[PDB]
Amino acid sequence: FLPIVGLLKSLLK
């Protein structure tokens, strides 16, 4: 349980 989305999908970064 660690959905960053900022590294796991790079939302912005």
The first five atom37 places (N, CA, C, CB, O) and aatype in JSON, in Angstrom:
{
  "aatype": [13, 10, 14, 9, 19, 7, 10, 10, 11, 15, 10, 10, 11],
  "atom_mask": [
    [1, 1, 1, 1, 1],
    [1, 1, 1, 1, 1],
    [1, 1, 1, 1, 1],
    [1, 1, 1, 1, 1],
    [1, 1, 1, 1, 1],
    [1, 1, 1, 0, 1],
    [1, 1, 1, 1, 1],
    [1, 1, 1, 1, 1],
    [1, 1, 1, 1, 1],
    [1, 1, 1, 1, 1],
    [1, 1, 1, 1, 1],
    [1, 1, 1, 1, 1],
    [1, 1, 1, 1, 1]
  ],
  "atom_positions": [
    [[0.83, -1.2, 0.0], [0.0, 0.0, 0.0], [0.87, 1.25, 0.0], [-0.94, 0.0, 1.21], [1.1, 1.86, 1.05]],
    [[1.35, 1.64, -1.18], [2.19, 2.83, -1.32], [2.08, 3.4, -2.73], [3.65, 2.49, -0.99], [3.08, 3.49, -3.44]],
    [[0.87, 3.79, -3.15], [0.63, 4.36, -4.48], [1.03, 5.84, -4.55], [-0.84, 4.21, -4.87], [0.22, 6.72, -4.31]],
    [[2.29, 6.09, -4.89], [2.78, 7.46, -4.99], [2.19, 8.14, -6.23], [4.33, 7.49, -5.05], [1.71, 9.27, -6.16]],
    [[2.24, 7.43, -7.36], [1.71, 7.95, -8.63], [2.62, 9.04, -9.18], [0.28, 8.5, -8.45], [2.51, 9.44, -10.34]],
    [[3.51, 9.5, -8.33], [4.49, 10.52, -8.69], [5.82, 9.87, -9.01], [0.0, 0.0, 0.0], [6.79, 10.54, -9.36]],
    [[5.84, 8.54, -8.88], [7.03, 7.75, -9.15], [6.61, 6.45, -9.79], [7.85, 7.48, -7.87], [7.35, 5.81, -10.55]],
    [[5.4, 6.1, -9.46], [4.76, 4.88, -9.96], [4.01, 5.2, -11.25], [3.8, 4.28, -8.9], [3.43, 4.32, -11.88]],
    [[4.02, 6.48, -11.63], [3.35, 6.92, -12.84], [3.76, 8.34, -13.19], [1.82, 6.83, -12.68], [3.4, 8.88, -14.24]],
    [[4.52, 8.95, -12.29], [5.01, 10.31, -12.49], [3.87, 11.23, -12.93], [6.13, 10.33, -13.53], [3.83, 11.68, -14.07]],
    [[2.95, 11.51, -12.01], [1.82, 12.38, -12.31], [2.33, 13.74, -12.79], [0.91, 12.55, -11.06], [1.87, 14.27, -13.8]],
    [[3.29, 14.31, -12.05], [3.88, 15.61, -12.39], [5.39, 15.48, -12.55], [3.54, 16.67, -11.3], [5.94, 15.76, -13.61]],
    [[6.06, 15.04, -11.48], [7.51, 14.87, -11.52], [7.93, 14.07, -12.74], [8.01, 14.19, -10.23], [9.12, 13.82, -12.94]]
  ]
}
